[PDB]
Every structure is written in structure tokens, then in C-alpha cells.
């Protein structure tokens, strides 16, 4: 369960997300990693899934993000698709929706995704020989 291939699905998606630059990866999300984190693994997954759902919900049709060129629009649609895929996997791992996020600090989506990737790679490392 805790070392399920979902971890690989999450890292794969994060790898695509962080290789991605778009108009809006500099817009912010609540920094769940600014905590003196006193949180189970499941609550951290819930936390990350919550802020990302807020992000894609709010920015899927945002004029700063949608793009002028074909390439920009394609990259925006890919970003939203990947955030939904990441989120779907995170909720699967969380096993809950009740996890208030209290942090004041905001980070760019870019920085938040990089930190999440580091955390996920560490979990994978701890699962593997």
C-alpha cells in the first residue's frame, strides 16, 4: 500500500510538470511545506492534493494562463491535465478529504511542485533497497 506504484505515477507526472514552463507556473499556492510539519504521510498527501485542486480549479480558464499562441495553449492544457492526474493519484494515496491547510506563506506552483517531487522521491527511496 504505502510503497504502491502510485508513487511512480506521481513522480512521473511531477517530472513532466517541472520540465514544463508556462505563463502561470509562477502563480502561487499555499505552501504546505512552510509548516513545522506535524502530519502523517496521509495528511501530507491530502494537503498537497487540496492546494493543487485549488490551483487547477482557479486557473484552468484564467486569461493569464490560457495563452496567445497554439503552443502556449497546448502547454496550458497539458499543465491542467497533469495537475489533475497528479491530484487524482494524491487523493488515492491520502484516503481522506478532511485536512485543513493553515499556512500563510505562498509559494510559486513551480517551487511547490519541485518540493513535492523531492518528498515523493524520498518516499520511493525509503521503499526501495
Residue numbers in the entry: 1 to 129
Reproduce text from the manuscript describing this model.
Interleukin 4 (IL-4) is a pleiotropic cytokine that plays a major regulatory role in the immune system. Signal transduction of IL-4 is mediated by a sequential binding process, initiated first by binding of IL-4 to its high-affinity single membrane spanning receptor chain IL-4Rα. This intermediate ligand receptor complex then recruits one of two possible low-affinity receptor subunits, the common gamma chain (γc) or the IL-13Rα1 chain, into the functional hetero-trimeric complex to initiate signalling. The overall structure of IL-4 comprises the known four-helical bundle in up-up-down-down topology, which like the crystal packing is unaffected by these mutations.
The structures of the IL-4 variants T13D (max. resolution 1.65 Å), F82D (max. resolution 1.7Å) and T13D-F82D (max. resolution 1.8Å) were refined on the basis of the structure of wild-type IL-4 (max. resolution 1.8Å); all crystals were obtained under identical conditions, allowing detailed comparison. The structure of the super-agonist variant F82D shows a different picture; the side chain conformation, i.e. the χ1 and χ2 torsion angles, of Asp82 is identical to that of the wild-type Phe82. Interestingly, the high-resolution structure of variant F82D reveals two alternative side chain conformations for Arg85. In one, the side chain is not hydrogen-bonded to the Asp residue introduced at position 82 and is oriented towards the solvent. In the second, the side chain interacts with the carboxylate group of Asp82 via a weak single hydrogen bond, but it is much less fixed than in the variant T13D. The distance between the amino group of Arg85 and the carboxylate group of Asp82 is 3.2Å and therefore close to the exclusion criterion for a hydrogen bond. In addition, the temperature factors of the Arg85 side chain atoms are elevated compared to those of rigid main chain or side chain atoms in the variant F82D, indicating that the stabilization of a certain side chain conformation is not as rigid as in variant T13D. Here, too, the carboxylate group of Asp82 (F82D) forms a bi-dentate salt bridge with the guanidinium group of Arg85, thereby immobilizing the side chain of Arg85 in the ligand-receptor interface.
